[model samples]
Target: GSSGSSGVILKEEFRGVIIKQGCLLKQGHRRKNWKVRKFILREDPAYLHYYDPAGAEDPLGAIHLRGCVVTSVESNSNGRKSEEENLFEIITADEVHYFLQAATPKERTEWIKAIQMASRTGKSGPSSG
Candidate 1:
């Protein structure tokens, strides 16, 4: 038995594997609403994608890590007392700022370091150790 047009073509939309993933509260760019999102950090492509924890498989948004800056901060822009601590920020090359809140200080440090490393070594070819 033979089938016509048997071969299937595929396209790659999102790239890279998960380096780190966790639940982080993200501050909205337009509304300033703090919502909990499931975050996935990927290498090679160096993307940080966030998904709605209660929603479907599609990511809510993605942040490009190449040439981006990450830093730990004490508080958000609202200047109000944050219910939780261990806040950090990612400023993209285009100067777009993303605020994220980790569960603990240790977790925040880990996230910052992971993002920094991925952004640094993502596109460039690795050399001999």
Candidate 2:
């Protein structure tokens, strides 16, 4: 079958996924089902451009976000040579943000639900799965 953002997703999953299979996801979707009362992804102080007296923002900081999830993994530049894959795996920062903004309304809802669950309740089980 065709490859898509799934690969990138796998990569990200390695980092962290809000709610995995039997985790909070097992429960129905609703703000009440989650432990995460609220979340905030603001600029990181360590990464802030303090050195640059006129710095705009913290470039090194991980981009702040209310929260998000991998609702869908559509294809981008599939079938590229492995070398190129190593060169540039996923889309750019701007593009990722673009997708997040343009994602379906449903996606946004699910993401909030998942992250909230993580923040408030903690892991749904011994293994997120």
Candidate 3:
């Protein structure tokens, strides 16, 4: 007798426990084109995953937040003036820069604080000697 295997698939966004999630404009690294993406921040494993709002459930990419730096940016780093407001940057431990824009100043501050807390949490485990 042959046994049958169970087939089940889980959505990428549901892989980890979500800490915070929202929509924000993400700038392309090479093309500089800004596109709105749904960002999901998860802990335990510490990952920041982005998905196309109009696309499927699979995430387009993910950023590890374990040792990354999140900061607010007033202008573009290319020395060019930016028309977009409430912008921020996330620099990975590898030094890769990711520019993101929030819908408002309040939202930007909230995201920065959330990311900072998540990053710190990822750095250490539960209290244990």
Candidate 4:
């Protein structure tokens, strides 16, 4: 709960940064027992970064991986499946999003959008803006 009750959340993500092992980040709404309409992921999924030269500030630096279908976790701590059906499990490293050292702010923004699209609706045409 890094801060408030709910809404858009920020994360180091399962993205690039390293974690301290016990730290966790998640949408706060579900934590408060609210019914979520849609699980929108603003995090740019690493899945879309490859094939599209349009991705990342430096496309060459990006990593590509396959998409995975959600499946029941043998151990969803906090008893997710029994307690909260909304919880999902994706294989760690199912995809990879590369960091762009020289990417423009605009390009980074687009990359994030691509991730959000992938996480939410599975895919979207990377809109040229």
Candidate 5:
């Protein structure tokens, strides 16, 4: 553990869906259908960005990883799967919660790990382990 590489250890591209606060329905509040969105994690900047894979192709929004927390919701399944295999939430320091779902347990775990690493690195500086 002495190589001393202080760069991004993880820059992952994943498929998931996210709904921002402004996009929520006014009443009845039904969840939106899952779409094929793209996710990016950058260790140098320590942030996560989600975007529409089609159209103008710019980030919809981004979350700074510093002071962020990631949690799993056992019943937050987006579609036909166990919650443990799909859902997680990112609660930012400002208390904004973002719910996301992945295609599989492995992808979920990878997202969690990368985000948490970004969180730690964002707060303490760049050193992912």
Candidate 6:
């Protein structure tokens, strides 16, 4: 449930860094939307969680990954981020789509594969690149 020295409650889930748009970053109502987060993806129920770097006891929030779709971003996925490098979208079960960018092309591919795997199995291997 911990990454190195970071007190993060992450298990055998797909975890990585994602820059959630400041707008979608709002937890329920709002907070610092646009920020870097240690992303976590777990299987079975497929829960998505992001931990703050400031040592928060709990994740900023969690989302169901079941029925969600993860795919590479097309140029039109978002007009603002169109053509941006390593951009992708996770369209949740409820149709709320979250756009995230990976630090590298390899990371992007790994995250996509891990998310898809976890969404279906509720478990994933460690994210190493």
TM-score to true structure, per model: 0.76, 0.22, 0.74, 0.23, 0.62, 0.61
Compared with the true structure, the alpha-carbon lDDT of candidate 2 equals 0.27
Clashing pairs in 1: none
Candidate with top lDDT is: 1
Clashing pairs for model 6 are: 22-33, 22-34, 43-122, 43-123, 44-122
Write out the backbone clash pairs for model 3: none
C-alpha positional error of residue 50 in candidate 4 after TM-score superposition, expressed in Å: 2.3
| Cand. 5 Cα-lDDT | 0.57
Every candidate's lDDT = 0.75, 0.27, 0.74, 0.30, 0.57, 0.60
lDDT of 3 at 90: 91
Whose TM-score is greatest here?
Answer: 1
Where does candidate 4 have its weakest 10-residue lDDT segment?
A: 18-27
Native-referenced Cα lDDT, model 6: 0.60
- Model 2 TM-score on a 0 to 1 scale: 0.22
Which runs in model 1 stand beyond 4 Å of their true positions?
Answer: 1-13, 29-33, 76-82, 125-129
lDDT of candidate 5 over 96-115, digit per residue (tens): 87767666667776777778
lDDT accuracy of residue 73 in candidate 6: 66
Report, for all candidates in order, the number of backbone clashes: 0, 5, 0, 3, 0, 5
Cα distance off (Å), candidate 3, residue 3: 32
Candidate 1, residue 90: lDDT: 90
Q: Model 1 RMSD to the real structure?
A: 7.6
| Residue runs of model 5 more than 4 Å from their true location after superposition | 1-30, 76-85, 122-129
Flag regions of model 6 displaced more than 4 Å.
Answer: 1-33, 75-84, 122-129
Cα distance off (Å), candidate 4, residue 80: 48
> What TM-score does structure 5 among the candidates reach?
0.62
